[PDB]
Every structure is written in C-alpha cells, then in structure tokens.
From a paper:
The Phox homology (PX) domain was first identified in the NADPH phagocyte oxidase complex subunits p40phox and p47phox, and has since been found in proteins in every eukaryotic species from yeast to human. Despite relatively low overall sequence homology, PX domains all possess the same core fold, consisting of three antiparallel β-strands (β1-β3), followed by three α-helices (α1–α3). An extended sequence traverses the protein between helices α1 and α2, termed the PPK loop as it generally contains a conserved ΨPxxPxK motif (Ψ = large aliphatic amino acids V, I, L, and M). Side chains of residues from the β3 strand, α1 helix and PPK loop together form a binding pocket for the headgroup of the canonical lipid PtdIns3P.
Residue numbers in the entry:
A (entry chain A), B (entry chain A): 8 to 35, 40 to 77, 89 to 123
Amino acid sequence: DFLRHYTVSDPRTHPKGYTEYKVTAQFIPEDVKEVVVWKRYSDFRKLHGDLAYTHRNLFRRLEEFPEASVIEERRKGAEDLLRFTVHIPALNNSPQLKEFF
Amino acid sequence: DFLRHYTVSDPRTHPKGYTEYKVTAQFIPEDVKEVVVWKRYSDFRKLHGDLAYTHRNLFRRLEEFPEASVIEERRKGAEDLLRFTVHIPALNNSPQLKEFF
C-alpha cells in the first residue's frame, strides 16, 4: 500500500496558452515508486470542489438520556490541497482522487 | 475481540432504597461470552455525561483553494445509551466504558 506524499512543481506554459503543473504522487523504507501527471488549475478546482463536498460531511445521529507570480501561489495552493488528503480515509480512498491520476 | 451487544433488564429494589438494573454485555458464531454487572441510574448518568462529552467532538481543520413505571423508561434509556456506543470506535474503545465494567 505504501505511504503517500505529494509534490506540485515545475510550471510550464503550454503552446495553446494555459500553464501546466507537474504533479508527483510519491509512494514510499526510503525507496519510492513515483506517479507523475500534468494538470491545470481547472482540474484542481474540480478536484477541490469534489473533495470539499466530500469533506465537511459529519453528524447524522443524537445521544439522549432520560509579474505572473500568481502561479506560485496556485502551485502552493494545489500542493496544500493534495497534502491535506493524506491523513483522512474518506479523502485518501476517494474515487475522485484515484480518477485524478 | 468478538462482537458487542447490550441488554439492560430486571429492575430490582435494593434494601437501602435505590433500584438496581442488570447490565449484560454480550460478546458474540452464535456462542456468547457474557459479562454481567449491576448499575444504578446515577452511574448511567455519569457514563452518559462522559460519553456525551467524548461524543460531539469533531472538526479541527479547514480546506482552502486559491405506578413507578418510570424505571422502564430509564431501563430503555440506559439500554439505548449502551447500544449507541457499538458502531463508534471512539465510544467503543473508550476507557470510561471499560472502567464501567
């Protein structure tokens, strides 16, 4: 099953216009099997939306007794988004995260 | 580890005054190892309080992207309280529940 790590880096400009981000999903001992894809911020928005709806899902019972440096911030944002899904079973085993890769 | 079931029954009046309830914790195949104790409604109130504080404990992060028949009702109430703790790891593995028996 390994352990999951994530790194979003290396922003490249596509000939069509939009910038692309390199997404690295590391499966780690100290030897790692890596899975690399390329995504744009729109896909990150979609994933964020799906996860955010998946997230904040709790409580169903009671108790009772009786200078285009914005791509850097986008990079770090997507990175935080991916890293936030590590220690939550609902997000880590989410089908949207698996279809994402 | 077995599977947990609970039955609160057989209300008896203690010579000192207070009524006592028979609490059966069943550890179940179809053959069950039983653990029986006797409790009063005060202990049930204490347990209920500890569990209720233990319960309703969620959310610590963000997301981001940019005719004294009242003893019957008391019996059923305590029974519901015990049965409610089965399918929750935080309540099932609670030390208050283990000290209770």
